[PDB]
Amino acid sequence: QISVRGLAGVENVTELKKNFNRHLHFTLVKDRNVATPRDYYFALAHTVRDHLVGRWIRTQQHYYEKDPKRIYYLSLEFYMGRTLQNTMVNLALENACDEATYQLGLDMEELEEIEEDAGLGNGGLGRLAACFLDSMATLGLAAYGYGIRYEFGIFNQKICGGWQMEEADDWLRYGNPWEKARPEFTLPVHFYGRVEHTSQGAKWVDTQVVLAMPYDTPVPGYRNNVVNTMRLWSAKAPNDFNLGYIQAVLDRNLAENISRVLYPNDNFFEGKELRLKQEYFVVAATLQDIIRRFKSSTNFDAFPDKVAIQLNDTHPSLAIPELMRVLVDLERLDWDKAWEVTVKTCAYTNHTVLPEALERWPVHLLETLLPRHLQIIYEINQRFLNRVAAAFPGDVDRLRRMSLVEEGAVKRINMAHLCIAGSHAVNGVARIHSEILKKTIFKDFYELEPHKFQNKTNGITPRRWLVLCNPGLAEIIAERIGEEYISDLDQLRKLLSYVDDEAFIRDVAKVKQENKLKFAAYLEREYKVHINPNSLFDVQVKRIHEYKRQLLNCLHVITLYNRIKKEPNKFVVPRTVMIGGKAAPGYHMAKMIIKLITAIGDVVNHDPVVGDRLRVIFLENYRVSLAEKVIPAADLSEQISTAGTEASGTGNMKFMLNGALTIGTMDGANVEMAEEAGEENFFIFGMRVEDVDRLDQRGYNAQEYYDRIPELRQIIEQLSSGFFSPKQPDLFKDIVNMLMHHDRFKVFADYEEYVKCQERVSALYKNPREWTRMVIRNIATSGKFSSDRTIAQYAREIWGVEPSRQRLPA
Amino acid sequence: QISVRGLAGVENVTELKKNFNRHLHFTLVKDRNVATPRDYYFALAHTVRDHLVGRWIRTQQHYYEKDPKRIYYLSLEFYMGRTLQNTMVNLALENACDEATYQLGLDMEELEEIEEDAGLGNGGLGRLAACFLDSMATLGLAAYGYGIRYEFGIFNQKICGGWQMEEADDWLRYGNPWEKARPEFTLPVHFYGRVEHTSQGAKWVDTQVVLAMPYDTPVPGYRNNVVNTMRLWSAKAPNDFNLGYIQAVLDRNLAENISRVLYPNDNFFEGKELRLKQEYFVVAATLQDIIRRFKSSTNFDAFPDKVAIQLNDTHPSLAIPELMRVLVDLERLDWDKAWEVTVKTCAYTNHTVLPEALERWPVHLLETLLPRHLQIIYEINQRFLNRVAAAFPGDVDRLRRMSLVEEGAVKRINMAHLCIAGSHAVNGVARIHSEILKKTIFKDFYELEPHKFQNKTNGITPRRWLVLCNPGLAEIIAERIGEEYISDLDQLRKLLSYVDDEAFIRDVAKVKQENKLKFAAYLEREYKVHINPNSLFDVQVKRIHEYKRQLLNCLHVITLYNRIKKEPNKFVVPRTVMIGGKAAPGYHMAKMIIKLITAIGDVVNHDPVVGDRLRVIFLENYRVSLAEKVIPAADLSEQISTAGTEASGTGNMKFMLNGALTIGTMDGANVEMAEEAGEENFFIFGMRVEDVDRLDQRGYNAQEYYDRIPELRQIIEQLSSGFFSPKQPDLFKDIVNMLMHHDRFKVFADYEEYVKCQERVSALYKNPREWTRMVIRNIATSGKFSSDRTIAQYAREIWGVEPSRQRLPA
Ligand SMILES: COP(=O)(N[C@@H]1O[C@H](CO)[C@@H](O)[C@H](O)[C@H]1O)OC
């Protein structure tokens, strides 16, 4: 149908059809008389999978032959989403499969909807790892993603009575056609035990053993025939395990629970033992795998020249002490040599400045679970502080501040400090974030080793986030500048010469309207809800957090509602406000915010006077597959976190690439997005980081705003009086109390500027032509936000490897 | 190579080879540079599996088209063993695959050794179900095997320091290529809850729900293109399950533990709740599946004409109350009509008279777990006793004896009584056993309904137990009478006309010697142990039990040892005594018997004076795959249970078919085997059932034998003094104490006759020609013991269906 989807050659379609029928018969053991859509989905998945094998096998032996420097990306999360369409796109098989299935009397689009999302992540951090894998394969890097194969990913969210209900994400129920178990490469992981000091070195003995079984998933690059590997570990109990008899076998579940479920707290620190076990589990198995591959290609001096280990936040921070343990205790290298190798091998990426997200493990936990590692950490700390003392003689408080060991109620190990000390590079994920790291949180470390600190602004893959989810937009773009931009997003800048092209302006607007119609239909089909396709689609989708300020959005919605009720017959630009996102199961306030959103909808959506001028919808179960549907349909992207709290953000980049204008604060990557597109083409409002600091020095008093802004006062009084909860008048008391007395994120402080900025958005929207021209200016300058640019920078500035665009043989 | 293994046609071998390489590449994702023997095994398994699919799909739709009466064999055990060779044999692909793999430079025999045994059974009962499935498919019956897919089958046995050690049988570790998950046919199973009595019927509410997910395994008939199904259920927790968050997800294991592990007590009753849950789990899921299939082909009057349910012992006895529950509570049939349907549908097979093997469930357990079923059982009992009272007016003790409810310390439900009341047929598994059932255990029931009682002597499949494990013997037989006997074992009688044929006599002896050499080699290769191939192979393999009397065998071995030490330079027929079998994990005495066997070996195998005239070996980890190796190599089969305790035995039949002579008591099927071959061709000894009863009436006093038999006294004194345990002098005190004061199985009573009988065995062995002629007379008359004969009798006399030999289309 469309160009960018590849060719549908006669011999290709014929081949696909026969292989489809072959899998349906021999693999699924069914025939078209009893086959259901799910059977058809699997037949298609196995057919497409077959086309990956040849490339996967030769890519890997290619690396074995050339022995390039290998990149290991360690992460506890990989938010992959669906794999079928992405694979077809990268292999240029989409139109051929579309034709083949069509000829078989099947709609490929409905078969794709059957696949379960691989939701092995919470949100931004997990999705970043996924985009990174796609870009590393596309850039021809010998990269490996290493993580945990969770039996249960992020929970599925259901809304009952306006409240969030959680249910297990049993994503492996029907099987996973994309993975390949490699039980033959199973490795042992040790826990507990004690340390023995012999004549020659320490020994970790009397340990409990848990096996790590790897499962490999292919990661195809964009049409370059490169297929890398994502290896995820699954926990298995040994067979001598617990060896009355029956109970011993049932207790095997104790050890296998390590890979059972993903913690769903959007990575806010919860010092639970199971979480620590997961972190060591991935680190221990991965490192053995890395060393094995290194020895099978003993001077470890060349180790850093053949290996790069990237720590995705501090979750895999134990890789530092574990690498030291292996080199010193097992390989017998002297400490200083082992440390040199470790530092040159490891690099650390920080993803947030929020204090409650930083990992600070109780010493007593490490002491019991990983005795040897605690000893190694103490030694690292001693030697590190000796260096600090030599550089800043007499500065005793600096020694206390920089220590890896934190004193107080209970001793804790600051994992961020451990990562900085043991890595040759430390980076933030957006310019403003990286600067904040050097000015505040890690100031002392920056002063000691300035050369270690870098910035690597985040990005998103244009394959999944443009070509896959918005073929219509990708097509009209390709018609003008070709298809080269798909792997070189900077070429989108060529579109600036079309900002005055009436034809292009019309097509851009047409694509958006089509996406909105498609989404409006979806809302009614799988969830039943009417929405005016001719209204402005105001969208805020991301995890529910106080720092992301969904509450500020709520205040604006209520303001719009009160103004309409005030002057019913006055004209206002119609809007359908959509808010979606999951709340951590034990985050009370986050759950109350979801309830408030639905409560507002209950009132607004049923007010006769409002009509179809304002609708408020809470998008249930926000996840990667849903993002692929709602983002292309958005007109306005809400990125309104308090300045200085959102390290980068990536959803913001997805909206920019898909034709939505952005209303937001100068926070995270928003700053760079506005710089690229031009401030006049962005809806910027609110306090800047400097303003937030001034307010804190003075002392934030929410009452001041309440007393000076009549419209704000009215909203609070409505919330407090039970206007949005007639049966439970004081239902939102906690929310009001927080806003009025302990709001760490200053919602009221940005209210006035936010509402005014929103008025300007509405003004531009009623002038279709100028709205679309601004959209074109945004799409045209979104090139910097391709994860291909991000990965190329990591490769050249941190890993020491040159990216390649050269395609491999088939 | 050999005839009975099929043809190796050019186009077949060529096709097999390419499909093998196809699976190695696309399915296993490997290439011959990194592939290991295990990869090769899987490539071959998938290749052979492909040839089953076509037949499997058409067999099933054939039944859907013809709508024949369906046979449902319910069992908690299916001891299948390996599937690769069996599949090739039944599809006539053995030689072709042998050639194809040969041409690829691979030895098929070593690839077959890689497959794990599907050990979903304890021993005889589980293996019988497996032989039955093979025969039902071979006889063209629309039969379905229904059971549980245990994650862990019977434990693997390791011998350490002469003691049994158990380890988890993680048979699914590397995957199971033979099964096909059918998650789409998942069904709910209810537990706990309470009963509500409404205006129209009772309702079972507030239950806990566990899902039953089926996995289908194909069961090919012998070269008739029929492929039936064995459906095994796996337990899965629902997704709303337990819905802090993390713990709720981890607690899912509580519900899934139902299908986690097979109880390894060789079916001796252990009233544990988990076991009861397993029994209801299989019954509830299976019945819903049966009714669904029945409704998709509502007068249930025809239900018995389209459905037959065979209960393999009382393990699935809840099928009776469950069928009543569904018909009465859900379908709304009146009780009497529902009962008529139930009785005509169900049939019960009893497998033992031993009291500690009978299921008697505590009422309080049923009361809590299955409230509605307990009420239905009480009603069944009331109505049944009303019938007894009418038939035997005034006989109050009969009412107490026949009640389904047993009174005493704790109320219990006798499941055997429930099965008799609710089945139209009840059978024993050997003539003597069935008679014993009518004369003792079930005498009262026989008097009330004589027409219900039948006999169905057990049998074994000649495919696995002759063609597969002993190709050499199958070949020399086929050379003389053709291959028709493989599916009509009675034709072996034609071999009687060859008992005087010098050529045949030589070949039979040659095949046995070859098998012994092959096994003798195996013993040294995987377990390292020397054995004289020219000695008599005396074998007793079966589960370790006091009733099977491995202890009697031990006394004979020690007697032989003492006689040699007595007259060192006297000639004696050389023997290598082999004993193997697993002991239930909590069966102390059984574990002490294993220790005694190894202890005797430690002394005998290292006595210079004995030399190679006597060897005692304990065969570790006895299982189906090992039986296939040792049985063809045996000369003497030990079947020495106390008369009246072994219901039938099936191992005895395997030895007879493979060229071993039998020494045994007139117990179980031994009686019929001797009748078929002729008493002069069997080594019969010991008390008959009548003799055992006379002894009990008089009172068994072991001391009497000890005082009158000098050789027996010497053995006991050696055991007691620490002769076989120098470091632990009183190690075998429990054994001696038992033999001397509380031996329920009268080991001493059969000692003298046993030793004398063994002398006659040795006498015949030193006359090779006459030994082989007697062997021929045994093989020639083993036809009655084919499970094809057994199944044909069940079909005609119980299920009401006619077996067929007609082959289906390809
Ligand atoms: C500790 O992980 P987080 O998920 N951190 C997130 O990482 C994402 C990926 O770099 C950023 O785009 C987000 O702005 C940031 O909040 O903690 C909240």
Ligand SMILES: COP(=O)(N[C@@H]1O[C@H](CO)[C@@H](O)[C@H](O)[C@H]1O)OC
């Ligand atoms: C309750 O099951 P069992 O395994 N019973 C066994 O069933 C087998 C199959 O019919 C018989 O050949 C055995 O002689 C008998 O002992 O109990 C010990």
Ligand SMILES: *Cc1c(COP(=O)(O)O)cnc(C)c1O
């Ligand atoms: C891109 C993405 C995120 C990150 O969104 P932000 O607004 O940067 O927090 C979270 N969840 C999903 C499913 C995503 O696709």
Ligand SMILES: *Cc1c(COP(=O)(O)O)cnc(C)c1O
């Ligand atoms: C045949 C078989 C049995 C039954 O043997 P008996 O001597 O009848 O108890 C037990 N275990 C295995 C593995 C078998 O093959």
